[PDB]
Amino acid sequence: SNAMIRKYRYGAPFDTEALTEKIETAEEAFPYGEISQKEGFAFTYIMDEDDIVYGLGESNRGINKRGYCYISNCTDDPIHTEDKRSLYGAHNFIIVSGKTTFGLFFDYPSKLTFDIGYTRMDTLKVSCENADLDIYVIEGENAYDIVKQFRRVIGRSYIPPKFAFGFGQSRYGYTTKEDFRAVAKGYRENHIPIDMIYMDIDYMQDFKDFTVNEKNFPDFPEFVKEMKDQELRLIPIIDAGVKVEKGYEVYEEGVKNNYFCKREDGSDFVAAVWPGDTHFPDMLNPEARKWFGDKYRFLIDQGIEGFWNDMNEPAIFYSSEGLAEAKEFAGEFAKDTEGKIHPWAMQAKMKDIVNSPEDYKRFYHNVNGKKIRHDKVHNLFGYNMTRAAGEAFERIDPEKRFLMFSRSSYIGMHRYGGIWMGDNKSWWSHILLNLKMLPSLNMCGFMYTGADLGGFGDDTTRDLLLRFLALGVFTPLMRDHAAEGTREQECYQFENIEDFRSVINARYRLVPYLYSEYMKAALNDDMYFKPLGFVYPDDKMAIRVEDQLMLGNEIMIAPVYEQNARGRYVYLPEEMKFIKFMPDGSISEEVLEKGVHYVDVALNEVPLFIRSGKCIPVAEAAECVKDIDTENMQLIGYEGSSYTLYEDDGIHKDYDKKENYRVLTK
């Protein structure tokens, strides 16, 4: 069993349950580089100058990770600039690819530093404070094989309901029924396809998890039905923090049953987030997990079929301890007359209390009757929150798939939900960031993923949103989302709405193909998006391409990500058909041979490339997933080619039936 994977154990590792496959502890010396326990733990490896390093799932910068530093330490940071070392995810899988090729999974739940050529260009160094971890070494002939080995042992990826392959609209600010009705009307009356509207935190009663503002929604199930009758499914948010409030059932049950994270003295740790003071459910405690997950029944019973989990790093605006320190410092500042306490020292203190490393040392988890300080298992919180929900869905309705995705994650969580790429910005560079994160996430098991289209923070423009949407066409999560106070970002808020209808039409025409590829990849522990080097390993030009991706085994995508651009350069590793969905509803095709090309792609055109000897089915445009006609779709691509289409009811879990597959021949 497991010939190509070995597990090297150091110290007394916390069981993260990342792997579903049990691997015995190897007894020989670590097989690559050098291991040191002199100062905590460190792995050091000298790379060949041609080596490529893949992996790290949701992390900064590019597909080839060489040339910077990455720290796995789930952090709420809304400014994703090139300098940042830590985002929301901790995905500790890397592959060194070159003359010598191997994969490593560092199963460690705390702060883990990947120095990938940052300090010295030839040096890979992975280090942490405590030598209590399992390291899995995965052997293979090439990077792709190694990923496929890893994907097997971590267990099958989460599978969403088919409606989740539609388009979704979201905004931090939708509050009332009139707000949601205006979104519904803005899309439906302009014939723009859409299947989901997300409800952000304002739908709750005073930000209380598992409540609904009954002044705004006096009969919430009727409203959910009003929307669902128009094939619009409401997707509400759930946050990590449970408001401290007398008589609020979730809070009262958590205190009484000791389901919250505690301080050293056993009192319930107070974290201030949106509701003000809150407690955090002890996500690492099975009983607390079951309790918290069960609460989703509150919304499910009202007709809700999907959720998103937010703030689950967990984010902290301040603790009671931090606020007191802050107010004391402020007092000294206010009465200084000697210029001893400067305004930036005050400013620094205010910043310091947010997501404070000290705060993460102030609370504990109850695991196996043992108290574990949170910092030591920090990266497992978001993971276990989403696990709580996922495990509850199986108890609540085991026949049914629910839409579920989370902000923070760790490998293992991919079994229970997807992720969205968090708080990006209305920056052109974030289209590229969205693109590059995709294959890396697929390597670590996270297939259902995407970014806030148009950009979350700051102000978008008509053309940025259109180019963002055109990449979104291909990402399983396709959601336009925007921050409070930003320029309105709904498709109907711009001139010439027909261009938005055109781009989102392309998504819906491609839904049968994209869903089919997702399912075939998920069911077979394979990738939906792949770097070119996985498909064309013998092409030195191909292995270094980072702004094109292969999807399934049929197509390649290459989005435009420059403002004012009317096309872009591409490298084709084999002959392909260059395809564009045109604003008049037609599909243009042009055969292009292997090599470098500049392709013209207008703002309202959606491009893709179909590989030699392949074809894909394309449906006529429909305005919701339910209405897509998959009976005799048109086949686009090469004569003589065939395609195996996976199709099921999109709702239940009857995956292994011959009726789910049909061969289409062009």
Ligand SMILES: OCCN1C[C@H](O)[C@@H](O)[C@H](O)[C@H]1CO
């Ligand atoms: O502190 C902010 C909390 N949230 C962060 C999420 O990333 C974002 O998508 C969401 O709109 C927002 C409000 O719910």
